[PDB]
Design a protein around this ligand. Structure first.
Ligand code: SF4
Ligand code: MG
Ligand code: MG
Ligand code: MG
Ligand code: MG
Ligand code: MG
Ligand code: MG
Ligand code: MG
Ligand code: MG
Ligand code: MG
Ligand code: MG
Ligand code: MG
Ligand code: MG
Ligand code: MG
Ligand code: MG
Ligand code: MG
Ligand code: MG
Ligand code: MG
Ligand code: MG
Ligand code: MG
Ligand code: MG
Ligand code: MG
Ligand code: MG
Ligand code: MG
Ligand code: MG
Ligand code: MG
Ligand code: MG
Ligand code: MG
Ligand code: MG
Ligand code: MG
Ligand code: MG
Ligand code: MG
Ligand code: MG
Ligand code: MG
Ligand code: MG
Ligand code: MG
Ligand code: MG
Ligand code: MG
Ligand code: MG
Ligand code: MG
Ligand code: MG
Ligand code: MG
Ligand code: MG
Ligand code: MG
Ligand code: MG
Ligand code: MG
Ligand code: MG
Ligand code: MG
Ligand code: MG
Ligand code: MG
Ligand code: MG
Ligand code: MG
Ligand code: MG
Ligand code: MG
Ligand code: MG
Ligand code: MG
Ligand code: MG
Ligand code: MG
Ligand code: MG
Ligand code: MG
Ligand code: MG
Ligand code: MG
Ligand code: MG
Ligand code: MG
Ligand code: MG
Ligand code: MG
Ligand code: MG
Ligand code: MG
Ligand code: MG
Ligand code: MG
Ligand code: MG
Ligand code: MG
Ligand code: MG
Ligand code: MG
Ligand code: MG
Ligand code: MG
Lengths: 231, 137, 208, 148
RNA sequence: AGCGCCGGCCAACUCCGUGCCAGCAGCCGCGGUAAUACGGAGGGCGCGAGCGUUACCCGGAUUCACUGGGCGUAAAGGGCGUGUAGGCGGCCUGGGGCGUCCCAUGUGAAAGACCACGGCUCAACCGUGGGGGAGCGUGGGAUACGCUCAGGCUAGACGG
RNA sequence: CUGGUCCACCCGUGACGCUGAGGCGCGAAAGCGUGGGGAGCAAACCGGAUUAGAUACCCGGGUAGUCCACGCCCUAAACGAUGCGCGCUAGGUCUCUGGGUCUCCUGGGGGCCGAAGCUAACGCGUUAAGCGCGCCGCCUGGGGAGUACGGCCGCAAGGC
């Protein structure tokens, strides 16, 4: 499922803004830039996917996290397809570590979904209409992919582990295994199942996350063909 | 340099703590014999006589445990603990009846005897004592 | 010597019946039966949490109060046990048990150890023949513990000998009524006794 | 369920205009007397809530102590800050020879026979955690061959 | 049958009297009119022909730290060099065997202590047997490490 | 005239090394002796203000001294409050000074930020306060006291 001209898409980046634990996954340093050994990226995509596979055919949830502008939209796409939860926007603190309390805020999300599905009163004072709606958009704005999550995931997939160290931390505290794509600005040992590739190119984020979803649906019940990529 | 032995053990302790696969220590027909015990007892994968810039070393292949669950995945050590006993500042010598039982059996005491470098267990077996080089677990 | 005073307050303070009298111990006229709360002005006040020290004092005192024994004599035995091979807690109980006056009461010749002393002390008991009036004689395996010949014909021992005819006596002991003579077979395994005592807590008292 | 002991319950305070305002702190150990112990320290505006919270955290933090005839396998020394705890194997009669803090932990853990010593700061809290991390580093003859 | 204690450490709580007084006190501390902390009392806890105080020794005190501590700010780096004695010292090979290690053997009195048993009705006390030891002398051995002597080396050091 | 130090070459020596009780030298300022010198500054000191007062701070004056030679003194927040040497344990950035195949790399030094680890915390972190060996110095509750006595040094002040 794997493809080999990811060279055509990503082969990493970043200058000496590195982390030296990532040494093992590195070929050489060219444009004043850390260049990732693709043959290692390979050994790993495999091992990661083997983990990814076993998780779909047992029907286990995956939490998708990425909020840097690059991976922002493409997680709303690729995760919706597998219908699995995500946070695209802001990563609220304690989403895993304080799940039951965070979630007590989705019942509020649902409660507005009902209360706005009419009527249950519109003789509620005018501003109160306007007020509650604003709240609705707000919840929707962060929680739109989170609600799908009704229990702690059996695993989580992250786009930037550094950028989302909080996430990685919360998972790790819970024993929730962490899969992530990650370039040289990151700490390897911190990831269980790892994709050493560029994490800032919309090209790259695209290849890696898509084939993930494609591998999810394929061993889940079905197969599908192409899904949206911004040119 | 004042204690070649202490130096070796420390080269090891220091490397094991940031999880190096190996580390080089200046070579000696005495340091080797100690490594011969460290490997045989499974504290190290083993050692091989290499060369750096024309000069003899012992490359020492380090061994750890499984990756772990929780926020600190750093594996457990195989050599949790290694320390000089005898020193140049104070030579420490035991007779056979007074060889220590490291860590309640689960650890070893390497010692130098006139029947070669032995462990506590081995020394008791041939029934000799000597300079107590160090302790490992 | 030994305690020699009101003996029901002992039980009440200990929060447990200790069978320190004999007969009245089994009746509903027993003190613990009527007032199962500590002697004196504040017995009914709500107890506040005993301290650890407090706890181990009581368990020690309880064990001691059972045997009517002085604190020294108690200590000297315990220390003996600490020097002696094995589990100290067991050996301690064992040695507490091998006391003549205790042996006698265990073989039923008396209703209370407190009565089993005055018997030994008044020489009505003997061992292997020879008379013994020492409440502290350390009885060994093999010993014949009998009522004195000149005491066989006595109202009280008769009444008390009559009461043992088929009540079974601990696995470490054999008893021959009519013959008025019992026998010390071995030292009690702990199971062989079921005293209301966590004896471990006693060790813990003496290690402070 | 688990057996439960309160080791320390202390009052602290903070200053404000108009006066000191208090808070309570609850050190609790929890165990099955058969090899499973947990330590929890919990704070709240009142005594019982604190004890409850404490007990809660305790269960959320455990360790599997490898007993052996009611004694630990080997000698262990651990420093947590300035506090030090010493744990040392003892044979059957010995009992638990220890101060309250590491006593409560070892008893509710099902340790029945051990020689111990507190060195350095004998602050209860720190001695508590120091005894925990100590237990948590215990290794079995197996554990060791398997490692090596 | 007595003696100490009953604020916390520390096991044992109420009434009266007193009112920063009289007094207690090992440390922290009690007493200024509702004192479990003074004095008496009832009651309770602890030991018992004893209980308590004073003195002194070790302990707790890893608080002189060999076992087993420390020195930026807590007590603690010499104002800085140079250097005497001393302490300590890289890689390789041999000789010696001083340290070191092992075996043998002598010594290591008796009593005491430790384990067994036994005699005084128990015990205390006392007897018989057993187990050893460090440490020193002697004899024989080992030679890894430290030493010493001897011969090599160049990674320390010094020089061009 | 003269010391230290770094680099490159890898040419020479063949462990010639580290530390160092004592000893010896050097040691800011103030101060001291003998002799110079003396513009500015300025203890003491005079006077004006300020102020309740103002033996101060602020203002106007002003002698030692501050400067030179030679000889003394030998202190200090003489501080990084961090003894010296060696070995080992991620990196990022700024900088001084070398040598390179001069993008960049490699030494020696000075800062910052940080991995592991340390640490009571604060913080330290290849310039360790990390992990280790060698040697030295020092601490062991506050005060009394860096005082007394003694000794040694000093012209004295005073120092140890
Ligand atoms: S009656 Fe027997 S048991 Fe009840 S109190 Fe008196 S002695 Fe104790
Ligand atoms: Mg990136
Ligand atoms: Mg030692
Ligand atoms: Mg007496
Ligand atoms: Mg207890
Ligand atoms: Mg015993
Ligand atoms: Mg009973
Ligand atoms: Mg009974
Ligand atoms: Mg004792
Ligand atoms: Mg285990
Ligand atoms: Mg501490
Ligand atoms: Mg410490
Ligand atoms: Mg054992
Ligand atoms: Mg304290
Ligand atoms: Mg008393
Ligand atoms: Mg007491
Ligand atoms: Mg009390
Ligand atoms: Mg009066
Ligand atoms: Mg009153
Ligand atoms: Mg009192
Ligand atoms: Mg009173
Ligand atoms: Mg003690
Ligand atoms: Mg001492
Ligand atoms: Mg003392
Ligand atoms: Mg020491
Ligand atoms: Mg100290
Ligand atoms: Mg200071
Ligand atoms: Mg200095
Ligand atoms: Mg000086
Ligand atoms: Mg010398
Ligand atoms: Mg020498
Ligand atoms: Mg040498
Ligand atoms: Mg030689
Ligand atoms: Mg010799
Ligand atoms: Mg001998
Ligand atoms: Mg003798
Ligand atoms: Mg006898
Ligand atoms: Mg004898
Ligand atoms: Mg002995
Ligand atoms: Mg030789
Ligand atoms: Mg030579
Ligand atoms: Mg060289
Ligand atoms: Mg050359
Ligand atoms: Mg020097
Ligand atoms: Mg000097
Ligand atoms: Mg000067
Ligand atoms: Mg001057
Ligand atoms: Mg001057
Ligand atoms: Mg002058
Ligand atoms: Mg004036
Ligand atoms: Mg005036
Ligand atoms: Mg003036
Ligand atoms: Mg002026
Ligand atoms: Mg002027
Ligand atoms: Mg003038
Ligand atoms: Mg003058
Ligand atoms: Mg003058
Ligand atoms: Mg400075
Ligand atoms: Mg400096
Ligand atoms: Mg100083
Ligand atoms: Mg020095
Ligand atoms: Mg030092
Ligand atoms: Mg440069
Ligand atoms: Mg250049
Ligand atoms: Mg400089
Ligand atoms: Mg530098
Ligand atoms: Mg500068
Ligand atoms: Mg820093
Ligand atoms: Mg850290
Ligand atoms: Mg650096
Ligand atoms: Mg420190
Ligand atoms: Mg003083
Ligand atoms: Mg002076
Ligand atoms: Mg002075
Ligand atoms: Mg003088
Ligand atoms: Mg001085």
């Amino acid at each position: 499922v794997k493809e080999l001209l990811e060279a055509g898409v990503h082969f990493g980046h970043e200058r000496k803004r590195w982390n030296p634990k990532f040494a093992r996954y590195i070929y050489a340093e060219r444009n004043g830039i850390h260049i990732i050994d693709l043959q290692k990226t390979m050994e790993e995509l495999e091992r990661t996917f083997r983990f990814i596979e076993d998780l779909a055919m047992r029907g286990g949830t995956i939490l998708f996290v990425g909020t840097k502008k690059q991976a922002q939209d493409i997680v709303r796409m690729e995760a919706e397809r597998a219908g699995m939860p995500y946070v695209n926007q802001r990563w609220l603190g304690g989403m895993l570590t304080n799940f039951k309390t965070i979630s007590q805020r989705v019942h509020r999300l649902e409660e507005l979904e009902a209360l706005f599905a009419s009527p249950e009163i519109e003789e509620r004072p005018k501003k109160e209409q306007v007020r509650l709606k604003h709240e609705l958009e707000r919840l929707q704005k962060y929680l739109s992919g989170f609600r799908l999550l009704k229990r702690l995931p059996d695993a989580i997939f992250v786009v930037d582990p550094t950028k989302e160290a909080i996430a990685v931390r919360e998972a790790r505290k819970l024993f929730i295994p962490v899969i992530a794509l990650a370039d040289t600005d990151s700490d390897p040992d911190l990831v269980d199942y790892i994709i050493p590739g560029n994490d800032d190119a919309i090209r790259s984020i695209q290849l890696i996350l898509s084939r993930a979803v494609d591998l999810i649906i394929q061993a889940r019940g079905g197969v599908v063909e192409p899904s949206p990529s911004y040119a | 340099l004042t204690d070649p032995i202490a130096d070796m053990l420390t080269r090891i302790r220091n490397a094991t703590r940031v999880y190096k696969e190996s580390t080089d220590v200046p070579a000696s027909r005495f340091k080797e014999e100690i490594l011969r015990i460290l490997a045989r007892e499974g504290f190290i994968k083993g050692y091989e006589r290499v060369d750096v810039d024309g000069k003899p070393y012992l490359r020492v292949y380090l061994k750890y445990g499984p990756r772990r669950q929780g926020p600190d995945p750093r594996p457990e050590q195989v050599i949790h603990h290694i320390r000089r006993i005898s020193k140049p500042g104070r030579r420490v010598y035991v007779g056979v009846k007074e060889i220590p039982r490291v860590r309640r059996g689960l650890g070893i005491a390497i010692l130098s005897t006139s029947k070669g470098v032995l462990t506590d267990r081995e020394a008791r077996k041939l029934g000799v004592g000597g300079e107590l080089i160090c302790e490992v677990w | 010597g030994r305690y020699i005073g009101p003996v029901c307050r002992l039980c009440r303070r200990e929060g447990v019946k200790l069978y320190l009298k004999g007969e009245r111990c089994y009746s509903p006229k027993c003190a613990m039966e009527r007032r199962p709360y500590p002697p004196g002005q504040h017995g009914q006040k709500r107890a506040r949490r005993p301290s650890d020290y407090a706890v181990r004092l009581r368990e020690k005192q309880k064990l001691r109060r059972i045997y009517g024994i002085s604190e020294r004599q108690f200590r000297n035995l315990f220390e003996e046990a600490s020097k002696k091979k094995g589990v100290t807690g067991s050996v301690f109980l064992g040695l507490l048990e091998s006391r003549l006056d205790n042996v006698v009461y265990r073989l039923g010749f008396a209703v209370s150890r407190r009565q089993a002393r005055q018997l030994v002390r008044h020489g009505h008991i003997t061992v292997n023949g020879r008379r013994v009036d020492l409440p502290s004689y350390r009885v060994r395996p093999g010993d014949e513990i009998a009522v004195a010949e000149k005491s066989r014909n006595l109202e009280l021992i008769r009444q008390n000998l009559e009461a043992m005819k088929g009540r079974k006596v601990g696995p470490w002991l054999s008893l021959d009524v009519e013959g008025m003579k019992g026998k010390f077979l071995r030292l009690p395994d702990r199971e062989d006794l079921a005293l209301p005592v966590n004896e471990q807590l006693v060790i813990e008292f003496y290690s402070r | 369920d688990f057996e439960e002991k309160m080791i320390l319950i202390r009052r602290t305070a903070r200053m404000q205009a108009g006066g000191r305002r208090f808070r309570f702190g609850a050190l609790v150990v929890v165990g099955d007397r058969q090899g499973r112990v947990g330590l929890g320290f919990g704070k709240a505006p009142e005594v019982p809530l604190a004890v409850q919270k404490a007990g809660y955290y305790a269960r959320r933090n455990m360790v599997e102590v490898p007993l052996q005839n009611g004694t630990i396998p080997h000698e262990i020394e651990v420093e947590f800050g300035a506090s030090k705890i010493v744990l040392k194997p003892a044979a059957p009669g010995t009992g638990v020879i220890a101060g309250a803090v590491p006593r409560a932990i070892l008893e509710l853990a099902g340790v029945t026979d051990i020689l111990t010593k507190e060195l350095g700061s004998r602050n209860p809290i720190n001695i508590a955690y120091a005894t925990m991390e100590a237990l948590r580093q215990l290794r079995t003859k197996a554990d060791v061959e398997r490692l090596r």
